[PDB]
Design a protein around this ligand. Structure first.
Ligand SMILES: Cc1cc2nc3c(=O)[nH]c(=O)nc-3n(C[C@H](O)[C@H](O)[C@H](O)COP(=O)(O)O)c2cc1C
Ligand SMILES: Cc1cc2nc3c(=O)[nH]c(=O)nc-3n(C[C@H](O)[C@H](O)[C@H](O)COP(=O)(O)O)c2cc1C
Ligand code: NI
Lengths: 306, 307
């Protein structure tokens, strides 16, 4: 007998799967579809205080090894997602995360002040997007978390861009550990500012920023696993959510082995739609069956070093 | 049409833009001779320290479907060895030679450069100074290092860079590099640092040092490499860019050059296939150029179209 159940943040989740923020979670229809899916949870599109059109198109391109995008935070605005969380989400089906991505400290502070009562009343959980990106400037990062912690009377998580050396893992973890309200860390947002060139057209493939954009998919799995495990080790008091390169149950298995509690799906979900979650739960159970595991706790964070 | 892969830079002529990446098949005399005998346009010797280094415990390199992961730890025969190869053994009649230097402190690099100067003068060996927390990730330390080396090394040289991941960092690094006219080329990029490969079957990491964390190469890194190549191509118009990262085919090389590359270095692919790869890559790049109606590299270098 097996189970994908996860228990964390005073909630129970049927399985660890959820969408990545930015993917299939912008409109009412999308949020409802995520709620009706087999996913264990969902997160609403990273929001700004007011609606944002986002960058000019094309701004997303699917690729053999993943995706590249420079969406530019298109979203319906904070009021919209707050109302979804306050009055529409069926918390009886699954828990809900709200992703917040204010463009200044002030914006985050203002939104958090209003989110507080809805979190208290309904149980929505904040995922604060820190992905130059806030998390790549340690002073800006400390300031952001100080501000939010000061005005937001609840636990929350942070969505991180990837780091690429131990000095940075140490520096980031030192900061995160100074904030006990940060109860989860989502690793990772894209690998930033890659450049895809189409040999046939001799051109870039997205319009904004001269073709530079965030990489997702197969490209990022080892970087994601690195960041998941690095923070799993360095922030023992916190949960880690995995994000990056999940297409299969086996991929998800790797995230959990590295330390992941929840596993977010981006590029693969963009291409397949919310039905992917039935496939992913099935595949992960199958991997666990073949390896003789009954629960996620049996192998979470147990990757073997040499 | 008669096409040419010729490249001209730093008072040298290169038959084609291809060379090995530093770290790959360039450690021993036998390897250096084989690179020289190959169809490559050039070669670079293994990044050296002042004295020989055994490197990290094995396993420390693993080939992967989408590339490679490694934590070699700078195993090398020592500066004396590569200096001797450059001064006395290398056939400059066959192709130009780059020497990769990777001191573990600013002082080590300074002392090696003092001694390399005479050999650069006499034989024409070209320095690629490895700046890959990595020196290049510490802007003050980077400026400091380039100042100290420029002070003692009266020759043009290049720097090998780790990748950056945002415009603010592209600008900051370019600003520093633009302070040093002796830095005539920039090699982008070394490796995507500290990835972690986990083998689902064994439920373990695949290399031994650093709990399995190591540098990524191959298919994983091509868009990051192209971004860095083009970012510096744009921001350092007075310098040349050498590409490194994700080259398996002539088409990949075409992309490097489109992004701004003058020379194109081959790492993971070369590790897996050996030096015969250069015959294949030259032939493939010429084929790509023939199909796209280009005769020379200068016709499309850095000409990637934005939308
Ligand atoms: C179309 C698109 C939009 C995204 N927007 C957001 C976003 O609003 N907030 C966020 O934290 N991450 C955003 N991201 C990054 C994803 O959340 C995720 O971190 C990344 O795609 C890695 O997962 P993948 O490898 O599964 O694609 C976006 C990604 C894509 C592809
Ligand atoms: C085995 C191995 C050893 C390496 N050692 C060095 C080195 O000594 N000096 C250096 O600048 N880069 C070193 N690197 C990085 C490579 O030069 C190259 O930048 C990287 O592998 C990306 O190219 P690829 O995608 O073609 O593998 C090494 C890479 C590999 C795979
Ligand atoms: Ni930094």
């Amino acid at each position: 007998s097996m189970s994908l159940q996860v228990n964390l943040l005073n909630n129970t989740f049927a399985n660890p799967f959820m969408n990545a923020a930015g993917v299939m979670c912008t409109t009412t229809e999308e949020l409802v579809a995520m709620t009706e899916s087999a996913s264990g949870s969902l997160v609403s599109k990273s929001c700004t205080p007011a609606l944002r059109e986002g960058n000019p198109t094309p701004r997303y391109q699917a690729l053999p090894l993943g995706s590249i995008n420079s969406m530019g935070l298109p979203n319906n605005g904070f009021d919209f997602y707050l109302a979804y969380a306050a009055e529409q989400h069926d918390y009886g089906k699954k828990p809900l995360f709200l992703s917040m991505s204010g463009l200044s400290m002030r914006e985050n502070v203002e939104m958090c002040k209003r989110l507080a009562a809805v979190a208290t009343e309904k149980g929505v959980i904040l995922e604060l997007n820190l992905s130059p990106a806030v998390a790549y400037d340690f002073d800006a990062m400390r300031q952001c978390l100080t501000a939010v912690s000061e005005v937001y009377p609840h636990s929350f998580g942070v969505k991180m861009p990837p780091y690429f050396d131990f000095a940075h893992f140490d520096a980031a973890a030192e900061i995160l550990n100074e904030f006990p309200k940060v109860q989860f860390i989502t690793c990772i947002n894209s690998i930033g500012n890659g450049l895809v060139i189409d040999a046939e057209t001799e051109s870039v493939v997205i319009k904004p920023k001269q073709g530079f954009g965030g990489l997702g998919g197969r490209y990022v799995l080892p970087t994601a696993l690195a960041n998941i495990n690095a923070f799993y080790r360095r922030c023992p008091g916190k949960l880690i959510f995995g994000c990056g390169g999940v297409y299969t149950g086996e991929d998800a298995f790797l995230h959990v082995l590295a330390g992941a509690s929840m596993v977010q799906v981006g590029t693969a979900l963009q291409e397949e739609g919310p039905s992917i979650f039935e496939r992913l739960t099935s595949e992960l159970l199958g991997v666990m069956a073949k390896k003789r595991y009954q629960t996620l706790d049996e192998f979470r964070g147990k990757v073997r070093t040499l």
